A paper describes a structure:
SdgB first appends N-acetyl­glucosamine (GlcNAc) moieties onto serine residues (O-glycosylation) within the SDR domain using uridine diphos­phate N-acetylglucosamine (UDP-GlcNAc) as a donor substrate. The subsequent addition of GlcNAc to the glycoproteins is catalyzed by the second enzyme, SdgA, yielding glycosylated SDR proteins in which each SD repeat is decorated with GlcNAc disaccharide moieties.
Despite the biological significance of these two glycosyltransferases involved in pathogenicity and avoidance of the host innate immune response, their structures and the molecular basis of their activity have not been investigated. This study reports the crystal structures of SdgB and SdgA from S. aureus as well as multiple structures of SdgB in complex with its substrates (for example UDP, N-acetylglucosamine or SDR peptides), products (glycosylated SDR peptides) or phosphate ions. Altogether, the extensive snapshots of SdgB complexes in multiple states provided a mechanistic insight into how SdgB recognizes and glycosylates the clustered serine residues in the SDR proteins.
Author numbering:
A (entry chain A), B (entry chain A): 1 to 496
The structure:
């Protein structure tokens, strides 16, 4: 059995999360058993994984110990008719919210919070004593069951939390002591195998959990090396684990030799004999990493992404309008302001020009402030993250990348696959390998926005070039075919 | 069903505890159903009640909610062979103790404490985090099961405790906030009837518990009015409760009218309409209480004690030795130093004179310091509390009372029943009613130790008087026959 250990799945899948799900889906078609492992306690992981993987394709560490691994949404429960009718409570609704303040004849007992406005998903219930101190907090799983009660000291500080199975029995206790005004774990108690287990740390918990999963002939893959690497260090070398680096390995990629390893990858680099091999997306990173590693351990380039069959419309270009697209999380590294600037000084040459920015991150408000400021309300659109952008690549003229560090770009390959050529700063890793300037898009010089504006403008000018590049895009997309990577993965696993 | 609500049973039965058990044993022979109710959380109440009542004669409030009402000692468990063999722990024994320090390969996890030296009764286990902070304490019932985990904050302060049933499910949560450097309850959560219940206070818990017990035609009796009276105040008047006063009702018994009610009985006196009637031991206290109450509610004198069949030896007096006896808890009110003094200045007239002081309280060390100081090692004996003093009344010449306030004296009647006359300061209540000077012992003037010494000396001088008084002792013992009180109790219950 092959295990792809990450942290968890977001509401919006991240680059690492999409890469993991891709490995799983290839291993599915290949015929080899595989499973995603998730370490992070997250009571919405059921909802988050529904449109991508089955509850049997994943084990969550906390679910495992909560005997809630492969549990489904149970039947919905009317919490409000329970409280009113059954409990003879009264429910003062909080205004502009899915919240409530529960009372028993003028005794304030609890503050209820729901996710949804239909009041079907109970999020948390907060408990109060005689003097309206918030003593205890009850968190609920999206599948219904009470997952975790947390106990508060002083200023709503976390003293300890208790994780329950869906039947209500305690399976896990965590004891917090406040270091640097933030709750640090100091004791963990795990009820498992009709026995009591003690760990000082969530890492020690991580290690225990792996040793349970592990049978002889099973293989691990560490994908959030921040958390996964420290967990594997406390695991016997007898247990094979393969490092997977999801990005650039060093702080400044221009200083190949005189640069520290990223805080995230420092642990695995320190214990390089622990890992059977290490996997990057790009040939360059295999070469660069192996030199820095000095060939202590084998390195392989298997790309996080692949091209699949296209059974939606490709390159149906309305000759009157020009759709440019960014498909990138709204984070600072992606430098999406430069694209709003580019569209600023480009409307006068191409009016009825549109830029559709697919993603949701932290820079949402900062980005929105510019599209407003420059009057680009009717030309630039902050389209929320969405999977199945196949209908959204159909009328796309170009893809833009203006990030500075990317590693393999999943959104870059996805563009080429839909025959949409991409104009990207010439950075490491990914764009270099995936783009041949004047083959399937252009490599621009880093942060050289005038070069950027010139080529984007040139490409909007001669559609004969867009069509030529759009062809070669599909061509390049094929070298990363689902077959190319099923084999490439199968060969890698067999050698190990 | 008749319920006799107290707090709990000690290792050593108190006057209130013995009085309650007596009521129960009379109601047994009478044929009316009865049960002791105990409010106090005490995990040794099983052991404490074994030689006096059956687990079906008593309901403990916490046992009730812990689904541990009428549970027996389960089979003994080798905690040390569990920890060594099963858990692969190592057990560093603490010297001069039934304690242990549990370790997992040099990780200090828990401090184990047993009651017994056979290491069969596990008392408590204390839990430690990475930095040897005492985070959590596990208390065990004497019947085996984990009763209560307690969670500690700051300086081993109680933040909250969780009460479990023997199967391990949580039945009760208590949340503490520190007022005046001592843990005060502020929230209680009770899992009962497949529902959640909230109380601010242990009194509110007390009231709830009663309303569950109570069926139509059931009768209550409040015997620790400190705790029981406040509990009954929050109970519907529909529920009959009868006050039972176990002592003198006022702070100074000499100030019948210009004296405050005792802190212990203040609550019932404030809510006198709540109680259907009020029961004292002595006729005098019925008269005194009814005048102070102004006859708002009926008062009855039913004595806490009775005389039973004597099938052990009575008055087998070794003519060469003189055994005097105190049968009184070693507390200050009993003034037992005066008896050590009396024996001091009495050895020279009666050498080979013995005083046997049956009791255990707080004054043990203070009392022992005098028997030592005055060289009375071979004449005065601090015999630990013991029930079945029937073999111990056999060679008794006299009983001494030198207390100042007593109410009915159980040990006084018990003396008379064994034909042992008693010499007692002339106090309220009890001695006045039970002793007729020159009938069955003598009433001495309060704290008049020279009068005391004179009569005790006179009675040791003429054994013809001891025999005459010893007869009339048995005579008086009969007026308080088990039959006299079965009837007296039956008449009282029927009128109500």
């Amino acid at each position: 059995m092959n295990y792809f250990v990450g942290n968890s799945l977001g509401v919006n899948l991240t680059g690492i999360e999409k890469a993991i799900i891709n490995r799983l889906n290839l291993f599915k078609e290949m015929g080899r058993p595989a499973q995603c492992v998730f370490l992070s306690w997250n009571r919405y992981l059921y909802r988050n994984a529904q449109n991508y993987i089955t509850s049997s394709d994943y084990i969550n560490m906390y679910d495992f110990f909560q005997e809630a691994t492969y549990l489904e949404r149970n039947e919905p429960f009317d919490w409000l008719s329970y409280w009113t009718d059954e409990c003879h409570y009264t429910l003062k609704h909080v205004e502009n919210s899915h919240d409530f303040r529960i009372y028993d004849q003028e005794r304030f007992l609890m503050y209820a919070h729901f996710q949804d406005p239909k009041y079907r998903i109970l999020d948390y219930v907060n408990h109060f004593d005689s003097q309206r101190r918030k003593v205890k907090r009850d968190f609920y799983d999206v599948r219904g069951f009470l997952s975790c009660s947390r106990i508060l000291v002083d200023k709503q500080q976390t003293l300890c939390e208790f994780f329950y199975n869906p039947e209500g029995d305690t399976k896990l206790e965590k004891y917090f002591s406040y270091k640097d005004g933030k709750p640090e774990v100091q004791k963990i108690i795990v009820y498992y195998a009709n026995k009591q287990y003690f760990f000082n740390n969530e890492t020690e918990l991580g290690a225990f959990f792996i040793k349970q999963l592990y049978q002889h002939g099973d293989l691990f893959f560490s994908d959030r090396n921040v958390y996964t690497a420290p967990i594997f260090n406390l695991t016997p070398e007898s247990i094979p684990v393969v490092a997977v680096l999801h990005s650039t390995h060093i702080k400044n990629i221009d200083a190949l030799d005189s640069s520290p390893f990223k805080n995230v990858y420092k642990a695995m680099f320190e214990n390089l004999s622990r890992y059977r091999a290490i996997i990057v997306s790009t040939e360059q990173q295999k070469l660069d990493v192996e030199k820095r590693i000095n060939h202590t351990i084998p390195v392989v380039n298997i790309p996080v992404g692949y091209s699949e069959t296209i059974d939606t419309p490709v390159q149906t270009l309305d000759q009157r309008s020009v759709k440019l697209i960014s498909v990138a999380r709204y984070s600072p590294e992606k430098q999406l302001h430069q694209q709003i600037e580019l569209i600023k000084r480009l409307v006068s040459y191409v009016p009825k020009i549109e830029l559709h920015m697919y993603g949701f991150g932290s820079e949402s408000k900062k980005l929105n402030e510019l599209i407003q400021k420059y009057g680009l309300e009717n030309h630039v659109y902050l389209r929320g993250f969405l999977s199945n952008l196949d209908q959204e690549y159909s009328d796309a003229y170009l893809s833009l990348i203006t990030s500075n560090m990317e590693g393999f770009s999943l959104a870059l390959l996805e563009s080429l696959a839909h025959g949409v050529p991409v104009i990207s700063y010439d950075i490491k890793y990914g764009p270099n390998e995936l783009i041949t300037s004047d083959f399937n898009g252009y490599l621009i010089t880093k942060n050289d926005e005038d070069a950027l504006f010139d080529k984007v403008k040139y490409v909007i000018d001669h559609p004969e070039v867009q069509q030529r590049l759009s062809k070669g895009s599909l061509a390049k997309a094929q070298q990363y075919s689902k077959a190319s990577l099923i084999k490439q993965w199968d060969q890698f696993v067999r050698l190990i």
